[PDB]
Amino acid sequence: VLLLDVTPLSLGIETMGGVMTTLIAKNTTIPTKHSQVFSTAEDNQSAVTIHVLQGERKRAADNKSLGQFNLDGINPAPRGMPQIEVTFDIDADGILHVSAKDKNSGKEQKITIKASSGLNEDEIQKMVRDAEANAEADRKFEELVQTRNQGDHLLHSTRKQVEEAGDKLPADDKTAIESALTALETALKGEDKAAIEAKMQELAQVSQKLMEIAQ
Amino acid sequence: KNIIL
Structure with missing residues (x-):
């Protein structure tokens, strides 16, 4: 008191x-x-x-x-x-x-x-x-760390979803998805938030059919 | 190793 x-x-x-x-x-x-x-x-x-x-x-x-x-x-x-x-x-x-x-x-x-x-x-x-x-x-370092984690999530989450799909995924879509994952996993290595968000854009656009399969 | 929410 x-x-x-x-x-x-x-x-x-x-x-x-x-x-x-x-x-x-x-x-x-x-x-x-x-x-x-x-x-x-x-x-x-x-x-x-x-x-x-x-x-x-x-x-x-x-x-x-x-x-x-x-x-x-x-x-x-x-x-x-x-x-x-x-x-x-x-x-x-x-x-x-x-x-x-x-x-x-x-x-x-x-x-x-x-x-x-x-x-x-x-x-x-x-x-x-x-x-x-x-x-x-x-604040900058935080919202980069959040971006890196969102990327990592999106990366691991997609890879699992690609395996559960197997044959169900058109060869084309797999080729395009795997390229974007390789480039994201690279970007995640670095410090450039913008570039990670760019590889996260590239994935969303090419993954539309993979998502559908996860039903 | 590392830990998350």
């Missing part, structure tokens, strides 16, 4: 694209416990890395690392099908516990990060500093 313990910077994890995903927002009163469900980036993926971040920057590399841990024992499945629940728990003593539970396999991996960990009062105000200074550049 005269003071509060609060988190001075956001706390979350690295997700696909090297983006920070926030679990506990800046200026939250401790104690506190928040959960979110994540999944696997690629097929038959046996493990995830849980990289813990403190900071307000969107690029994971621009935030302070507090540690990372693996959870393995993820049973083979399509990507985005496994449920990896991540929980950030800060108790009254200012300790952050982070868990990852595979909701199928019941398995679990924690890390404990002392109250003393992370950036000091000075480094904090610097971080808030750069966040506002590089809001623009961070």
